Amino acid sequence: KTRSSRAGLQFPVGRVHRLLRKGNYAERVGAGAPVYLAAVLEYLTAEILELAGNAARDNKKTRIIPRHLQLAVRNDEELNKLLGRVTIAQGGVLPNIQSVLLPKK
């Protein structure tokens, strides 16, 4: 009986318990910590896949590509900030032209 299934999680609680030890973050690692972390990690993955999935859909594609992660992240105020110092390879940028540069009159 896995600890993931035991916590109701798709993400690997055993692996996360392990990486927390190998990483030298403290002398000891409580059994709840990996449970919470695997959950948080799965929550965030779900949030971005949700939105990336929509960008793929909005673009008549059925396979998510890095462009889709980028529209997803950059369109979402909170993911954008969490990932404010992060570059997504092959993500491009958001279509955006400053008003003054448009023709009129």
């Binding site: 570059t87 092959q90 279509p95 032209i97 400053q98 540069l101 448009l102």
Partner: protein, 99 residues
């Protein structure tokens, strides 16, 4: 009667085009030689995994595009639409890349 788009119309069209796409905008080999040259002045007889060079390019293009957004913003603050070395310099000063 020979047809000419006015100045700024092909430029705007280009913004749309490149903002739409994600492909690298500097050519591969020229980029690669530059890397090999700069690296060689630090240390001789280096080799690069191809994905090291691809990582350097992806990183350099994202950095340059963003610097242009910041630069564009600095021109517009000066009520221009033409980017100028002083616009880039002001961007880099405020970003702390300079002072």
């Amino acid at each position: 009667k020979p047809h000419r788009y006015r100045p700024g119309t092909v430029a705007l069209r280009e913004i749309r085009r490149y903002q739409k796409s994600t492909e690298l905008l500097i050519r591969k080999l020229p980029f690669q030689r530059l890397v090999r040259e700069i690296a060689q002045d630090f240390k001789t007889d280096l080799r690069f995994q191809s994905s090291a060079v691809m990582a350097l390019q992806e990183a350099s293009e994202a950095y340059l595009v963003a610097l242009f957004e910041d630069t564009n913003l600095c021109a517009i603050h000066a009520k221009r639409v033409t980017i100028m070395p002083k616009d880039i310099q002001l961007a880099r000063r405020i970003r702390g890349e300079r002072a």
